[PDB]
Design brief:
Helix content of chain B: 10-25%
Largest interface: A-B, 174 and 138 residues
Number of strands of chain A: 11
CATH topology of chain B: Glutamine Phosphoribosylpyrophosphate, subunit 1, domain 1
Distance between the termini of chain B: 27 Å
CATH class of chain B: Alpha Beta
Oligomer: heterodimer
Shape of chain A: globular
Strand order of the largest sheet of chain A: 3-4-9
Strand order of the largest sheet of chain B: 5-6-10-11
CATH architecture of chain B: 4-Layer Sandwich
Shape of chain B: globular
Largest sheet of chain A: 3 strands, antiparallel
Number of helices of chain B: 3
Number of domains of chain B: 1
Structural class of chain A: alpha+beta
Number of domains of chain A: 2
Bound molecules: glutamic acid, calcium ion
Strand content of chain A: 5-15%
Radius of gyration of chain B: 18 Å
Number of helices of chain A: 16
Structural class of chain B: alpha+beta
């Protein structure tokens, strides 16, 4: 009764996502007997249809899996830069980065890993066949769904900046010269075909089949770099999670190529040296301490983080409590330290 | 970017964060596949010391390279309490993902907020560069005044993130919460 905000409650299974339809797809999979991984993959495919803003088959991501028995693992299905990618590929003739090249041109794309990631996880930790978890998404793409406020808003705001500039994109998301409106029905026939072939032929359809051909051609005709060799060489990678201990609670998150796990653990290590509970939420002291701690973490991020398969990341040092203590001792609860006075830490004494 | 969480009847948990990077990515569909293409390459450092779309900077470690995976900030996360999965969370937000998830953890452990309370609470963020303490609407004027007196450069900006989380009770019951910042989302179970 003292609560202003109440959580949703369930006794058996639960799914939380940015889209009602996708969430319901996941819940149905659970009700059908699928495990968390089965449902997670089903939700991922559904979002690739109902949440084109971010749900995808043409992007990448990370998955954290923790079995009922405690086994915790990370699935890295982050995109890989094309084999033809080069260090200065986004610089203009004067040597200055061109954000257009890295955000709106065909050169902005990395080789997609989502399909590979979902199959790696489904095959090893799931229980249902790919066709069964893809089916819900397939139907949504084939038969369509009603455009809601979220999608209508994003199409009008963010979509207007890029979707109408590409023939194939405009043919799907635009209508009568305007972004699809709330209430309209969005049918994605081509995506449905792609989903159908993945369901029937497996992930190879995306990385070596017709889809791979379509991606390669899209790139070749528009100055892009992703080739069939790139797609055939893509691999999702299972990696050990980065974790820490905060006041007796263990925190698990993504390891490099993500910087998330390392800095969340690093910052928590710093905060552990302060009585956060005493200060309380929304207090100037709590915010002061956390803002300061965050500065050091982001400074370290700019120097030490990258793809572990190419560079050695000093993750042990960065998540070392003695190092965190050395940072905590620098924090003045009454005076912020300008970022100009903060540089990546010296990790030598902690590695 | 988007994040979703799942916990089944057996207690297995999954947290997934995936993305095209910016909204709709490049906005380019791959031929007749109907698949939108990501613009994840902007997550690499294009040139040492020059910020990307999220204001993040880098050098050699995160430089563009063939077959290399660009550095991400994505943080699907699980917190364990008394040896058992307790909080499953994550969120979109580029550079802000780290601090948004961090706040979910701090709110849960230090402030003892239930998953919905932790989700609906306002967020703040400092990423070193730019040197500003970014805040959402929702903090007391008295508190922001004190922060400014401490030397923080407070900047009121757009709402940050979309947490989709699940907390597991001691008896195994499930509690969940979708973010008020995102409309048409949903946390449901059975
Ligand atoms: N591309 C960003 C996430 C972007 C988003 O939140 O849209 C990263 O991997 O850290
Ligand atoms: Ca909401």
């Amino acid at each position: 009764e003292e609560d202003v905000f109440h959580p949703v409650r369930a006794k058996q299974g639960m799914v939380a996502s940015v889209d009602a339809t996708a969430t319901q797809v996941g819940v149905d999979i659970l009700k059908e007997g699928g495990n968390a991984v089965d449902a997670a993959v089903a939700v991922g495919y559904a979002l690739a249809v109902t949440h084109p803003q971010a749900g995808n088959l043409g992007g990448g991501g990370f998955m954290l899996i923790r079995s009922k028995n405690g086994n915790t693992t990370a699935i890295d299905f982050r995109e890989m830069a094309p084999a033809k990618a080069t260090r200065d590929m986004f610089l203009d003739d004067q040597g200055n980065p061109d954000s257009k090249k890295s955000l709106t041109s065909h050169l902005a794309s990395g080789t997609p890993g989502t399909v590979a990631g979902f199959s790696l996880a489904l095959d090893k930790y799931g229980t249902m066949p790919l066709n069964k978890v893809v089916q819900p998404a397939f139907k949504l793409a084939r038969d369509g769904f009603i455009v809601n406020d979220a999608l209508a808003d994003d199409l009008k705001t963010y979509g207007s900046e890029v979707l109408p500039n590409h023939e194939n994109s405009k043919a799907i998301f635009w209508k009568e010269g305007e972004p699809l409106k709330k209430g309209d029905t969005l049918v994605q026939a081509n995506l449905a075909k792609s989903l159908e072939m993945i369901a029937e032929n497996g992930p190879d359809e995306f990385y070596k089949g017709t889809i791979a051909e379509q991606i390669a051609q899209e790139m070749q005709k528009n100055g892009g770099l992703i080739t069939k060799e790139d797609l055939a060489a893509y691999k999702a990678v299972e990696r050990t999670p980065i974790s820490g201990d905060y006041r007796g609670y263990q925190v698990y998150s993504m390891p490099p190529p993500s910087s998330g796990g390392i800095h969340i653990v690093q910052i928590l290590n710093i905060l552990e040296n302060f009585d956060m509970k005493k200060y309380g939420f929304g207090s100037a002291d709590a915010m002061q301490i956390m803002a300061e701690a965050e500065k050091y973490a982001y400074a370290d991020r700019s120097e030490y983080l990258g793809d572990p398969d190419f560079v050695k990341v000093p993750w042990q040092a960065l998540t070392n409590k003695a190092y965190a203590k050395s940072i905590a001792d620098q924090i003045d609860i009454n005076k912020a330290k300008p970022s100009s006075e903060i540089r990546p830490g010296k990790l030598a004494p902690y590695e | 970017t988007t994040h979703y969480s799942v916990v089944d009847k057996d207690g297995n948990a999954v947290a997934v964060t995936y993305t095209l990077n910016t909204t709709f990515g490049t906005g380019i569909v791959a031929g007749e596949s109907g698949i939108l293409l990501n613009n994840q390459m902007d997550d690499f450092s294009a040139k040492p010391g020059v910020p990307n779309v999220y204001g993040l900077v880098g050098g050699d470690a995160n430089a563009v390279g063939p077959n290399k995976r660009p550095l991400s900030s994505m943080s699907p996360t699980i917190v364990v309490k008394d040896g058992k999965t307790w909080l499953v969370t994550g969120s979109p937000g580029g550079s802000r993902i780290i601090t948004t998830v961090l706040q979910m953890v701090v709110n849960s452990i230090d402030y003892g907020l239930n998953v919905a309370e932790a989700t609906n609470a306002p967020r703040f963020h400092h990423q070193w560069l730019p040197d500003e303490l970014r805040v959402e609407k929702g903090f007391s004027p008295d508190t922001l005044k004190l922060l400014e007196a401490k030397g923080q450069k407070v900047a009121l900006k757009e709402a940050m993130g979309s947490t989709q989380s699940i907390m597991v009770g001691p008896d195994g019951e499930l509690y969940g919460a979708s973010d008020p910042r995102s409309v048409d989302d949903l946390t449901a179970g059975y």
